Symmetry: D5
Subunit: 167 residues, 10 copies
């Protein structure tokens, strides 16, 4: 694992799905803004994707504080694309406004210390990266428990407040 | 790579989709029969899956010579399941009678020497394993070119003929 | 770091201040209960200890869901006790309901991966350990931003709910 | 093995019998053409050389798609020439149209990953190399089962088709 | 330990409390003066701080012989400041004229060979460093026993004397 | 090389052609007899095979002094059989009384220090091995020059003589 | 160095001059008593050995508190004896009540961390070892500056006091 | 061993007895000529040295084909000279036309692979070296069995023949 | 390990010696241009008469008339050498002496000449003949109980000087 | 490297010696129970008179009356030693001799006694006094041009036997 608090967050690049198209995406495309970078275990499971949907539905609240949100699994960009194109009712994701980055090679998961070598995918990991590319926060959940948009917004707001005013 | 001609084919186990259900599958479940074990690059691409369909449609010809056929990619069993449940017309696989083994951890691809470390999936690799678990044939194609059911049947028939009659 | 989600949380033992007394405290003392185990950077700073006080003031919310809280810094047990004996209105901690564990040697901070080699103290690390001694959650924050009791309770509840009932929803 | 799909096929050079003469033959001599490069186990066995003869007898099918064929075993160039000079009706090879490369030192077999350390000869390995010297295909068979000219032509055609036009179908 | 008699005292730097405020302090800030540099185990313990106070009250005796005194423990500078701000009556140090240097990382203590790996703090170690930065004397005491200001003054005057005049006694 | 004068000749085994058929042959099959074991570079070359034929025709001279002869090259046993089956007139060996051992893996040749890494075959090497498996004599010739049956007979009789009677001449 | 505070003091053994006689001496011979174990650089030098003399002359202040003193240098036992048999007024040490241990091989000096590799003798090192053989105090001085008997006594008394009562205040 | 067929023969140099005089001799002194370079075990033994004698007595058969012979043992040049100055009829070698090279340090024997570590002398090793300094032939015999001048001649003639014409038939 | 090799430069040494009752820095190379007899003796002030040193002392003009110096060495300090010299013979001392007593306090010189006994802390009886070019010509090592002869040493020096000139 | 250490067992040696004109296997331990003077000389048959060996030969009864044997050694073979003995002195030989000449043909004995000159292939002039318990008591190493004295050797042996008994 290369992810260390107060150090540049580890570099990543891959293929994401953004508004239904394949795009090359780099961690460093987000310099100048806070980034919530998070991992989820797999597309197309039998468990509703409440957390991705929750982050998707609430994106303008991140955007109004100069923050982007990128989600990532070990799935191919082709799987992400199909998942998005499957309607929510059939067990799919549906349209989403959050980029789904593919970590097909697993390099990215390993660098972020979230990769489950016995399973082949990640745990639930979330990372808050500031506008200088510095890693400010790490949250790792065992699989059965998701993340909260509200907790994430508090953390982002607090790191931004302390960046300007100290303490 | 651990795959060597005339040596036991390397052991594998994982989750497969077989008739639309998840099943634990082991290379060694096929002892007593010839096995055509093959890898393909990914589910849900924009390229028709002619080869998987071809092998699927022609399965009884393998079965009448005591031969099973298993296909494998680095995709999750959940992705395989969704791919099978997407109709052929929408860019899916449709029903298939061939197990789709998941190599989510990539261990299996690495052992078979078919894993593309820069890409995160396999090339087009096919392996003929006899009823004693011994590896008899290796075919590796660069991605753009598929396999032939007829060539595969010739090879299986020939190895079976030579097992009994020599030469 | 020896701290791995899904594995036995790394063993620790040390001197804690518990109700104004020095007691030997061990991780296995918490077997049979959930444990919120968190690190904080230093006693006696000029910045209000709002986040440690919050946990102690709200401790019954943990205890009513069979969960204990232990706080830890690299400070000695003597510094802990002096901090506790300083009134909040003077910037002290005041009397507190949760053990303050001393990690003077730095071993526990290092095993938890929260030690800052260049500063000599830890960042803000929090760890949720189930009643079987298994690590379930790791929250690590840069120095300037504290933890939430509400978030921590949501996490503990969620882990106990899924411990008993499993999958979240259809 | 140095043989990797998508990488420059491993360089080789040696003495080949070409139209009953010894010539120095190199892999780069084939630049600008596809090359089917295959190994076979041994000259002068009691088993009909049906598979080597097939390739030579059908060579114009390769040449009309800008492809050359070179066969190779661990035998010396002298053994190759003697095999060629033995009539098919005596079990010899007879005159043949494709070079027979000698890999007497075993280096080329080893670079191709087809050498059998315990036997001192190769298995049945075949390699399709594009006109840029890149390896596109590896076919390795156990000893008792030969290669197909038809399969090999299908593969070469498919690689040239996708070299120019790309993806197979919608 | 890096501390060797007749070699430059091991470099150190850190945050010290000097007249009730945080200051960066370096060993090299003392070039041109003798330095009494001593370690004590911990702030805020139940044992009376006799030895630091004795050095403090008697500081002028060192200053009149061009000598500074600096004390050090593994406590943070914030704990050092709180201890100074605690009246001697409740267990504090009270106002003090000597800097309290913080060795929070434990590096300075390790470099001086005074750190106790099993307890997380130092034993009672004292060092006489001359005006040229050279280490002249090492005193190491097990925990229970303090240092004497008079003995320290005798060693300092002895070194200054032999610096200037070489000779002891015919 | 593992071949050392006065030590057991390096063990070997392989397939030999003996009276026109394949036989497994082992160095230890010769215990109780002297063995002339010699290597020649290749079957089927343009240079006349004078030396093998000379050993062949004169075999009875070795047999009458309890000595066997075995020849070896890196060719396969199939090439050895074809060479024997080729009339001397067209470039063959013709019928032959000495076994042709195959060293296809190159192991036996390496063990005897006769292998040429850059050519893939042996130089002209000959070894006299006594009835107790001990190596008594090594002759190594660059390629162009053959061995003499008379010289080989002189060495064999000399060793048998000194075996029995020790002495050379007063 | 093998000398570590709170750990058994490094074992030593060798020939000492005791009472103008050569005797084999061991650290373990001192179990049951406190030991002031001190190294001095060389016999027969041009500077008054008032520091070894001072310990010998005030020896009873150690013994009345169950403490022995042993002095040690890299000189041979023969040289120690010659030094003793040479009168104070003449460069000698004269008769002395404390054992002089020879560290001729330098093993003991190296074990105590007091050996100077470039000069071939020790600095001025003093070690306080309790009745259980545990090292309690280390005093190391650069060559020009001697030890004080009063400070050594203060230290021994303080260790013995805290051994029994544990608690300054 | 450094002696490898087809490679330059390992360089050697040392003192030889040539013509009853000590001379410095080198492998390179032989460039332009074929060299029979042969090792024999020891001077002064109880068995007829008929094998060195045989080479000396038939030396002209070598020289008429541009070939020199040099014999070598681990004995010193002084011993070689004593052996030469001792008459055949008395255990000696007598006068001899071939240089006797001393390998007293054993370096030359070890470089040629002929040294027996347990006995301290060589086996019966012979080396044929061409006019370009390339090693062409190695003959190694167990101690009891000598070399033949006729076979050596046959070998030299054959190398020279094939050097020029290349092709038996 | 020993650095003293016959026919090689004698190992370099430097230290304090007592010369005519005074301390002087002395080094091996001070002797270049002259032959040097350099010998070790085990210790000052033992109960065994210092016969051999006295013997070399008394016969020093025999060495000097053949351009040869003599230097004695033990591991004792230069302060002990001075006391031993300043102690009358009848009291067990050396008495006045006209050869330098070199101190090998650090023991490095003894170790370099291969005469140090690591279990005792002093040297055995070792003697070295070094020629005017600094070359070691002779090594004599005696177990403790047996001393060196001045006559033998003289014979050896004159023999080396003779063959230096005439072979 | 040398194994010869004063006060330790002399290094073991075995070889062929010429004794009274015959070959005999000889080993160091044949001398246990007696003192042994064991010395090396560089070579047989040189142009330099063999004075020292003859000297030890001629004076052998002086050694034997003090329970002491003498054995001479060079790197020459036992065959050369025999020829040298069987060559009359006036012809440059040794002539009849009553000390064993040991052959160190392999050079191991010379190396173990630290007397072998690796650039020349023979030994320097080395002499060893070994007591009746096999203990090395004295080492004398002389550069080539200078020989050993029988009188010194006698003095050294009698001195060791004297202090063995009386200190």
């Amino acid at each position: 694992s290369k992810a260390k608090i107060s150090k540049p967050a580890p570099y990543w690049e891959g293929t994401a799905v953004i508004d239904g198209e394949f795009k090359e995406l780099k961690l460093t495309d987000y310099r100048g803004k806070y980034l919530v970078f998070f991992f989820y275990p797999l597309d197309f499971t039998f468990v509703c994707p409440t957390e991705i949907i929750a982050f998707g539905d609430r994106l303008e609240e991140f955007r109004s504080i100069n923050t982007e949100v990128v989600a990532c699994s070990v799935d191919s960009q082709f799987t992400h694309l199909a998942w998005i194109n499957t309607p929510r009712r059939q067990g799919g994701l549906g349209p989403i406004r959050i980029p789904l980055l593919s970590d097909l090679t697993h390099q990215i998961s390993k660098d972020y210390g979230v990769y489950l070598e016995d399973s082949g995918h990640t745990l639930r990991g979330l990372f808050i990266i500031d506008d200088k590319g510095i890693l400010r926060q790490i949250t790792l959940n065992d699989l059965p428990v998701g993340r909260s948009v509200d907790e994430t917004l508090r953390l982002v707001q607090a790191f931004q407040y302390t960046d300007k005013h100290g303490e």
